Ligand binder design. Structure first.
Ligand SMILES: *C(=N)[C@H](C[C@@H]1CCNC1=O)NC(=O)[C@H](Cc1ccccc1)NC(=O)[C@@H](NC(=O)OC(C)(C)C)C(C)(C)C
Ligand SMILES: *C(=N)[C@H](C[C@@H]1CCNC1=O)NC(=O)[C@H](Cc1ccccc1)NC(=O)[C@@H](NC(=O)OC(C)(C)C)C(C)(C)C
Lengths: 304, 304
């Protein structure tokens, strides 16, 4: 038992990280087969981002303007192209540690692991959720761009995030591996900011189910609520309205525990209105919303 | 910026995990050079732990009673011995992915990463602290024993924990890699339990310094306290008394931020007495005590 914010083992992704240098800018790239993926802003100088014409900037560059270092070894760039906000550098060597992989675009509320990298080398791993405002609560410093977010299925790495920028409140925005930013954010110097960050209701309910699986049952009550009644409370306290689709994906956890989804909603509704009596659920004095229903099943049974 | 509970990249340790089977018991082992380390309880049946004489149990066994599987490959056990609560199985093949490594025993309050494993295969990674009651807040299921905890220096993996058992409150106890349990716990069926879990004061102060580095400064005040005055407040709210040694190791963070340690103690003292105004520090409504002063420096600057 016990329940922790748990990341995927990073070894498969560690073998894909390389360093990309263009001019005086150094960041990380993702080396899969004979292609290296990295943020396109690597071609900007300190004073190119004010009004960056990425097309003109890249047209001015050639292959020898891009340096790729894999550990101690220089990889020779033999081609380059741009796809949305991602630069694609063709190299003369296929990565011998290329994993089976997919490029996926996730929905808000879904989770993934981040391998934070500097100088093309792994530094740390942590678990993130794509917030409803399309930011993530990362930990990133100078040189971290090109770090990736991912999930693992069996032996297949699903890459879903590449890091580009930090917003004024210390949260972060990036793209999928096709270069399309999550949310309305862009790799330009405009007055961008994270909006209000709503609590992911279906994730909180999943975490409450995790608590029941772990023997924490004090918050359950014998009186059911309605979806409309629960949502009335959910708009206050800044929770996402619970949809029928969200009720649906909580089904497997409801069947496993014997607690009807609307009974758990009644429990959550009571917790919001009366507050937690300085009390812990899974050892936390707060409701956690960065576990999906699939995350709970994986950690509680699927890992075995 | 941003600050997250961050684990070390697990790839170096993933290559050391193997599966160990004895009788009907299957768990994980750590394969370094030509030795496999695993909990000695693997030699017990379901009804041997009531009064286990591990010496007699191991004397009855031979090499062919131990099966070690590294991925798809059986490793031949050619020797066996017991050191404290750890079994050491000599195999005929040295691990080709053996990292540079050390066996270390950590102090309470220090942190490490856990690679949770099942069937000798990595499942997830998360960050733990050795609690003052000598337990860790892990996430472990059946078959997880032999999962290890570690820190990484440069290229050297410092193994500090191997998982053995779960206590009634859903926390966990284990040994160092020499087989000596942390705390008063034993691999026997006695009425063991985690005691009161004290808050690691020096870690909370370190995290407050991390908040200042990240631009969170609202909790600072211009009035200093004394160590004795702070500790009077610290015994209430169940904080560890702050020692001069703890003040010492906060020195580098105090110099970096310009905030004297006793000024941060005054800030912490005010936070405990008046509570947090539903307010967030680093986006958390609570004080976090699972980051050491070295953890803060690593995440804020050292990773670059
Ligand atoms: C990439 N290495 C770097 C990562 C950030 C450094 C500080 N924390 C981070 O997460 N990102 C940047 O430097 C980007 C520009 C860039 C560079 C290389 C590749 C891709 C993108 N710039 C910023 O994140 C920037 N934010 C910013 O301008 O925010 C606005 C647009 C004003 C809302 C700064 C954090 C550097 C101020
Ligand atoms: C190892 N695979 C297993 C891991 C635990 C299963 C449930 N969560 C876990 O962390 N540990 C055990 O099964 C141990 C015995 C053992 C087996 C193999 C190697 C080493 C040790 N037993 C327990 O953890 C046990 N706790 C227990 O008896 O607690 C007392 C001693 C009564 C306080 C159980 C969790 C299985 C009840």
């Amino acid at each position: 038992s016990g329940f922790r914010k748990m990341a995927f083992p990073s070894g498969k992704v560690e073998g894909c990280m390389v360093q990309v240098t263009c001019g005086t800018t150094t960041l990380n790239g993702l080396w899969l087969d004979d292609v290296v993926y990295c943020p396109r802003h690597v071609i900007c100088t300190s004073e190119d981002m004010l009004n960056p014409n990425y097309e003109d900037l890249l047209i001015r560059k050639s292959n020898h303007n891009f340096l790729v270092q894999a550990g101690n070894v220089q990889l020779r760039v033999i081609g380059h192209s741009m796809q949305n906000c991602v630069l694609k550098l063709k190299v003369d060597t296929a990565n011998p540690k290329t994993p089976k992989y997919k490029f996926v675009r996730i929905q808000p509320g879904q989770t993934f692991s981040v391998l934070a990298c500097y100088n093309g080398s792994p530094s740390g791993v942590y678990q993130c959720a794509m917030r409803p405002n399309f930011t993530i609560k990362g930990s990133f410093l100078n040189g971290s761009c090109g770090s990736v977010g991912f999930n693992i299925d069996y032996d297949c790495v699903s890459f879903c995030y590449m890091h580009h920028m930090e917003l004024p409140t210390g949260v972060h925005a990036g793209t999928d591996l096709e270069g399309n930013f999550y949310g309305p954010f862009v790799d330009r110097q405009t007055a961008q900011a994270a909006g209000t960050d709503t609590t992911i209701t279906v994730n909180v309910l999943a975490w409450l189910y995790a608590a029941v699986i772990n023997g924490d049952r004090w918050f359950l009550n014998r009186f059911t609520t309605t979806l409309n009644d629960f949502n009335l409370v959910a708009m206050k306290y800044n929770y996402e309205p619970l949809t029928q689709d969200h009720v649906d994906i909580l089904g497997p956890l409801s069947a496993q525990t014997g607690i009807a989804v609307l009974d758990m909603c009644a429990s959550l509704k009571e917790l919001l209105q009366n507050g937690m009596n300085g009390r812990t659920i899974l050892g936390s004095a707060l409701l956690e919303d960065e576990f999906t229903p699939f995350d709970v099943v994986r950690q509680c049974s699927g890992v075995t």
